[PDB]
Lipid modified azurin protein (Neisseria gonorrhoeae), 126 residues
Amino acid sequence: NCAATVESNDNMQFNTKDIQVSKACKEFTITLKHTGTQPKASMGHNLVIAKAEDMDGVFKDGVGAADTDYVKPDDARVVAHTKLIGGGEESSLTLDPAKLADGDYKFACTFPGHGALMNGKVTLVD
Ligand SMILES: [Zn+2]
């Protein structure tokens, strides 16, 4: 109902490669759960939405941003993002699906190193 739940674990994996977002929604909420037991310092996960072509730059700038969820603040490339979470925690984001109509969007964890394994597509659907 204009909401989806994505899982993440101690093995550097999301449980999906595609998040479908209905453009019939005024707002869409994505909740990330961390089902592992490791702390966010060593196995932190977030969910960060940006154009495929912007994601590499978003990763690189996220490195210097550990105290802001490994996302450079005020970054126009980032449509939305959750907080960084550790084992047993959850964080949500809210976005306007209309913001995704202008490109091909991806999601990833921007915790340094995680992005190559923890990424996928964000897909507008009916
Ligand atoms: Zn992560």
Observations:
- The longest helix spans residues 55-62.
